Design a binder for this molecule. Structure first.
Ligand SMILES: Cn1cc(-n2ncc3cc(Cl)c([C@H]4CC[N@H+](C5COC5)CC4)cc32)cn1
Length: 258
């Protein structure tokens, strides 16, 4: 269970392994994949990444039919494991993670990359609980040479996906990632996801559009972050709040401490 000068010690999730260098004791994460055109694209995207709130790419090695993608280790594990079911987490902790998630998303959008699967399992934490956006297997280019390209592929994870993905032939990338961030903020503040999917047949989604916020999970959330969620989880992507306006929101700028 080794690759060149690295040993593969334990499974970090699915695969991704903890790679410990036998000589230096440096520890990184390595993604192992057994597709050739998909991995070439993913590597080009990974090589662009340079920000404190995004997992850094160290390089790749090919052994026969096996590809090894080496990346920055996030020793604090996932944000998912910090969310208490039915409770969430303390609001100051949720706001700090949300600021870091916005910093990472602004960075990605600034280089014309959309993640397309933002959710707590893909948001990792370093040793000082700094958030890192991970897994670029679904990531794509939405802006190149300053020209935006609409997306059409369905992907992501249904409870986090924006309604336009299900209803429109083509859609803008940025508002879809903004929406998934709103669902992550809901999960952090309530420890519960609001709907299986934001579709016409989902009653919990209809309830939200009718502003039935006396229901769960909304009733667990303070009015200030709920006011931000009312601006993010807006059905029409053209009326939905953009990141520059999230940065002007009252709760986003509210001082909080445990
Ligand atoms: C302690 N610890 C370190 C890590 N770690 N460090 C870096 C790193 C990079 C990636 Cl891509 C991954 C992935 C992230 C997507 N998940 C999927 C399963 O649900 C979603 C599998 C693992 C894990 C990584 C995780 N826990």
């Amino acid at each position: 269970p080794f690759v060149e000068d690295w040993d593969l010690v334990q499974t970090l999730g699915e695969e991704v392994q903890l790679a410990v260098n036998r000589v230096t004791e440096e520890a990184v994460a390595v993604k192992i994949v057994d597709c050739p055109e998909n991995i070439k694209k993913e590597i080009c995207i990974l090589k662009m990444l340079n920000h404190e709130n995004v997992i850094k790419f160290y390089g790749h090695r090919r052994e026969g039919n096996i590809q090894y993608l080496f990346m920055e280790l996030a020793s604090g594990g996932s944000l998912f494991d910090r969310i208490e079911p039915d409770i969430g987490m303390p609001e100051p902790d949720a706001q700090r993670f949300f600021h870091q998630l916005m910093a990472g998303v602004v960075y990605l959008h600034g280089i014309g990359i959309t993640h397309r699967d933002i959710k707590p399992h893909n948001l990792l934490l370093d040793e000082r609980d700094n958030l890192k956006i991970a897994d670029y297997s679904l990531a794509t280019v939405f802006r190149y040479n300053n020209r935006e390209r609409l997306l059409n592929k369905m992907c992501g994870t249904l409870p986090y996906v924006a309604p336009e993905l299900l209803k429109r032939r083509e859609f803008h990338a940025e508002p879809v990632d903004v929406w998934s961030c709103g669902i992550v903020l809901t999960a952090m503040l309530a420890g519960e996801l609001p709907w299986d999917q934001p579709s016409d047949s989902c009653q919990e989604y209809s309830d939200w559009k009718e502003k039935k916020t006396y229901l769960n999970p909304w009733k667990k959330i303070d009015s200030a972050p709920l006011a931000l969620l009312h601006k993010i989880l807006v059905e029409n992507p053209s009326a939905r709040i953009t990141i520059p306006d999230i940065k002007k929101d009252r709760w986003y700028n509210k001082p909080l401490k445990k």
